[PDB]
Amino acid sequence: LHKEPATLIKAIDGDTVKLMYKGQPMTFRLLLVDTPEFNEKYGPEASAFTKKMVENAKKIEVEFDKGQRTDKYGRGLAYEYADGKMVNEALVRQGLAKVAYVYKGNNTHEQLLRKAEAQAKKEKLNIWSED
């Protein structure tokens, strides 16, 4: 896999963001993560997390996996990096998202995400606070 340049157009919510990619404005859906919707418990937190992380990042990068690059809605499917830090992993580590089911072979960072998740769960962070 390889990281590619992208530019923030607009933060959306926990697992989606509007970015410019190769000159085209696109909606990207974060691979392997499921964040609560905005008007759902932990949704405002998840949205504020990604917003802050991406809005203050000098360099935004997109890394497509080995599987399907776009879903049925035309959204780009990738691992998003803000100044070298993976947004997907950062969310799961904070207990603001759970690892999602693999979508069409995009599973390269599945173990890494599961490890970020396990630690969040062990620390009873946010979504895991009722375990």
Per DSSP, the residues of 14-76 read SSEEEEEETTEEEEEEETTEEPPPTTSTTHHHHHHHHHHHHHT-S-EEEEE-SS-SB-TT--E
User: What is the sign, positive or negative, of the torsion defined by CA atoms of 59, 60, 66, 69?
Assistant: negative
Please tell me the total count of domains within the chain.
1
User: Residues annotated in the binding site for Ca(2+), as ranges?
Assistant: 15, 34-35
Provide the token pair at 80: 């998003």
Domain that holds residue 18: 1-131
Which residue in the list 45, 69, 75, 110 is annotated as catalytic?
Answer: 75
Q: What is the CATH number of the domain that holds 74?
A: 2.40.50.90
Residue 114 among the catalytic residues = no
User: Which one from 29, 63, 89, 117 is the annotated catalytic residue?
Assistant: 29
CA atoms within 13 A on the CB side of 108: 14
* Closest by Cα among 16, 20, 2 to 87: 16
75 is catalytic: yes
User: Would residue 69 show up in a list of annotated catalytic residues for this protein?
Assistant: no
Q: Give the span between the Cα atoms of 131 and 128, in whole angstroms.
A: 6
